[PDB]
């Protein structure tokens, strides 16, 4: 999907749905929010693999399966040398880096909630 333009302000129907997508620029943060929210939403395949050490290092397996550990986003966007929304698409990757901060804010995580003392993710965000 292409024509790297700004976000067309429809003024105003899905702007609240854009605000849920915000957790502008045309598509990348606009669709990829549904992609990753769909991903970690789909990655809640537990609530039946519980009463064991799944709460252990399988949590770290969920850590390695990041917002697919962001090189998957940060290869093709790293590869795409194109003047169309150059750094404006990446304004939704500085702003999807604010969604990387939303991902390390998507941090009421597991073990059911313990220890709530750190859940940071910013290696691939770095």
């Amino acid at each position: 999907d292409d024509d790297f333009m700004p976000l067309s302000i429809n003024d105003k129907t899905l702007y609240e749905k854009v605000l849920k997508i915000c957790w502008l620029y045309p598509m990348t943060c606009t669709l990829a929010k549904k992609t990753y929210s769909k991903i970690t939403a789909f990655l809640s395949i537990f609530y039946r693999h519980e009463l064991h050490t799944l709460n252990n290092i399988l949590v770290k397996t969920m850590d390695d399966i990041f917002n697919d550990i962001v090189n998957k986003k940060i290869r093709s966007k790293l590869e795409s040398t194109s003047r169309e929304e150059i750094a404006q698409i990446l304004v939704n990757l500085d702003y999807f880096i604010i969604a990387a901060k939303e991902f390390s804010n998507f941090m009421t995580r597991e073990n059911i909630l313990q220890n709530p003392d750190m859940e940071i993710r910013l290696s691939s965000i770095k």
Partner: protein
Amino acid sequence: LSSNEIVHLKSGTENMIKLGLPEQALDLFLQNRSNFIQDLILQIVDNP
């Protein structure tokens, strides 16, 4: 003093009453639920 279920526990409980040893019967029953809850605690502090 051995069954984690209900039906033998229910049954032989009222059979023990059917002998007429009800006080010992109840005390053993409460002991079974004591050991029951006791061992139910054996599945896990992880955080408080």
